Amino acid sequence: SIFRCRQCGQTISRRDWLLPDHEHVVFNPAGMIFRVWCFSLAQGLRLIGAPSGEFSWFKGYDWTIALCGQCGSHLGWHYEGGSQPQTFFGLIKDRLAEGP
Ligand SMILES: O=C1CC[C@]2(CC(c3ccc(Cl)cc3Cl)=NO2)C(=O)N1
Ligand SMILES: [Zn+2]
């Protein structure tokens, strides 16, 4: 029901906050594959830098790197500047732990 940072246990999100498919399998320009779950809402992150559109997986959205606010582990990206919705989070599924 709750998603925590796999590395340190920081509270991040909830199954209830998943945003549809909620799963997207993508590759960055360094050829790294991420299984990304989209969330309407997340907490306990630190958004680093200003947004960029470069190589955005989601048409009309700019991304900022989302670290775990506690341990600094890269948990995914915040997406902004789009429409329906304006903002959402793309979190790397295998860097989260699910439970009570
Ligand atoms: O939506 C996204 C999130 C982030 C991103 C873009 C990206 C990147 C951008 C510029 C440079 Cl110079 C180097 C990198 Cl390694 N890495 O992952 C991606 O591909 N799509
Ligand atoms: Zn963490």
Q: The dihedral of CA 40, 5, 14, 34: what is its sign? A: positive
Say how many Å lie between the CA of residue 52 and the centre of ligand 1. Answer: 9
Does ligand 1 lie within 6 Å of residue 77's CB atom? yes
Say how many Å lie between the CA of residue 32 and the centre of ligand 1. Answer: 10
Phi and psi, residue 25, nearest 5° = -100, 120
Task: Give the C-alpha separation, 6 to 4, whole Å.
Answer: 6
Does ligand 1 lie within 6 Å of residue 88's CB atom? no
Resolution in A: 2.0
Domain residue ranges in the chain: 1-100
Reported CATH class of domain 1-100: mainly beta
HSE of 59, CA atoms in CB hemisphere, 13 A = 0
